[PDB]
Amino acid sequence: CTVNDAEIFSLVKKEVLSLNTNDYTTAISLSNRLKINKKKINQQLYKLQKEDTVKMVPSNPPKWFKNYNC
Amino acid sequence: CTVNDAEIFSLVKKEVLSLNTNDYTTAISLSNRLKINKKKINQQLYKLQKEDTVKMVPSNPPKWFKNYNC
DNA sequence: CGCGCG
DNA sequence: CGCGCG
């Protein structure tokens, strides 16, 4: 009856996988689309990087790329 | 019914003002010596630094010395 | 303001 | 793990 963070994780993963290898996005942009708090978006983005689905580039703010192996 | 920001500020300010000239303390130490969450301790420490009561030296964890004015 | 942090 | 961030 409850959808913890897993549904957020799934929404974010689906979004990043839709990116072109050459494109990138940010937490603020993602938060804006999925209408979710940037904090929630970040909690998933960093977890997703641990799974190698996305790659973060320490820009200001960080830019997120889909793993090019995809 | 709860010790608020302003009140924790006073508690932290007193501990820091009781340090000898060149000795420091850390947020976790104050957290332990007192019965307050580390986050709440740091919230006060950085404000105390803005007020020139304490001085922070980066390290892990950050060291907090009494400002020489005191 | 980069912050994800338990 | 540095985090204080409203």
Swiss-Prot record, chains A, B:
It comes from the Viruses. Residues 2-68 form the Z-binding domain. Belongs to the poxviridae E3 protein family. RNA-binding protein that plays a role in the inhibition of multiple cellular antiviral responses activated by double-stranded RNA (dsRNA), such as inhibition of PKR activation, necroptosis, and IFN-mediated antiviral activities. Recognizes and binds Z-RNA structures via its Z-binding domain and dsRNA via its DRBM domain: RNA-binding activity is required to escape host ZBP1-dependent necroptosis. The Z-binding domain recognizes and binds Z-nucleic acid structures. This is Protein E3 homolog. It comes from Yaba-like disease virus (YLDV).
